[PDB]
Amino acid sequence: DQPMEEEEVETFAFQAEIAQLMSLIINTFYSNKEIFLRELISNSSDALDKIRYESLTDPSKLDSGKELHINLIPNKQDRTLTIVDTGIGMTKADLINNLGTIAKSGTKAFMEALQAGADISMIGQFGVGFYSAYLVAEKVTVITKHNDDEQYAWESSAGGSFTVRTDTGEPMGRGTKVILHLKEDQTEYLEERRIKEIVKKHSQFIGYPITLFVEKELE
Numbered sequence: 122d123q124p125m126e127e128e129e130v131e132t133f134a135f136q137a138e139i140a141q142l143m144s145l146i147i148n149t150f151y152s153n154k155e156i157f158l159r160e161l162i163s164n165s166s167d168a169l170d171k172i173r174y175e176s177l178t179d180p181s182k183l184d185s186g187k188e189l190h191i192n193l194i195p196n197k198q199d200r201t202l203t204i205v206d207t208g209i210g211m212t213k214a215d216l217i218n219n220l221g222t223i224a225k226s227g228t229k230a231f232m233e234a235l236q237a238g239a240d241i242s243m244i245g246q247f248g249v250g251f252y253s254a255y256l257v258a259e260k261v262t263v264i265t266k267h268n269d270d271e272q273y274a275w276e277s278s279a280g281g282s283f284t285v286r287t288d289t290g291e292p293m294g295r296g297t298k299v300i301l302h303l304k305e306d307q308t309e310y311l312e313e314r315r316i317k318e319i320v321k322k323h324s325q326f327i328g329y330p331i332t333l334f335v336e337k338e339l340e
C-alpha cells in the first residue's frame with residue numbers, strides 16, 4: 122500500500138544568537154506585541170520591491186504573476202493568522218541561510234540594543250523583524266515559492282531548531298506565506314477590527330494593496 126505522499130524533511134539547528142533572540146522574544150513580556158504585523162507586512166513590501174525591481178529588466182519574471190499585493194488571512198477555527206505576498210519568494214538555500222543558520226550582525230546588535238534600553242518596536246531596523254512573530258505565535262510556518270524553483274515549507278516552534286521540506290499542498294504562483302499559529306491568549310489578532318486598526322496605524326505608507334480574507338470552514 123503506497124503512501125498518498127512522501128516528503129523528505131530536514132532539521133537544522135538555529136545559529137546560537139538567533140536561538141537566543143527567539144527565546145527572549147517568545148518568553149518575555151512586552152506591552153506592544155501588535156508590532157509583529159507591521160514587521161511582517163514590511164517584509165512583504167520589501168519582497169514585492171525585489172521582484173518588481175527584477176521585472177524592470179526582465180518582464181518574464183512576472184510570468185508567475187503580475188499582481189503585486191499582500192493578503193491577510195485570519196482563521197479562527199485553526200487559530201492561525203496568515204500573511205501572504207506575491208513577492209520574490211525564496212529558494213531552499215534562501216530559507217536555510219536567511220531563516221536560521223546564518224546570523225547577520227543585526228541579530229546580536231538588536232539584543233544589545235534591548236539591553237541598552239531600546240524598544241522591541243525597533244526590531245525591523247536590525248533586519249530581524251520576522252522573529253517578532255513569536256511575540257504572538259507558538260509556531261510559525263513559512264511557505265515560499267521562487268521563480269524556477271519548487272515550493273518549500275520552513276517551520277519552527279522555537280525549540281532551537283527548524284525544519285524544511287518540499288510543500289505540495291496548494292501550489293503558489295510566486296511569493297511567501299507566513300502562517301502564525303497563535304498563542305492561546307493572543308487570539309485578538311484574528312478579529313477584523315484589531316487587524317484593521319493595526320494596519321491603519323502602522324502600515325499607512327506601504328505601497329501595495331493589502332486585502333483581508335476572513336476564513337471560515339463551513340459546517
Ligand SMILES: COc1cc(-c2nc(C)nc3[nH]c(C)c(C#N)c23)c(Cl)cc1Cl
Binds near residue numbers: 220299
Ligand atoms: C529579511 O528577513 C526575513 C525576510 C523574510 C521574508 N522574505 C521574503 C522574500 N518574503 C517575505 N514575505 C514575508 C511576509 C516575509 C516575512 N516575515 C518574508 C522572512 Cl520569512 C524571514 C526573514 Cl528573517
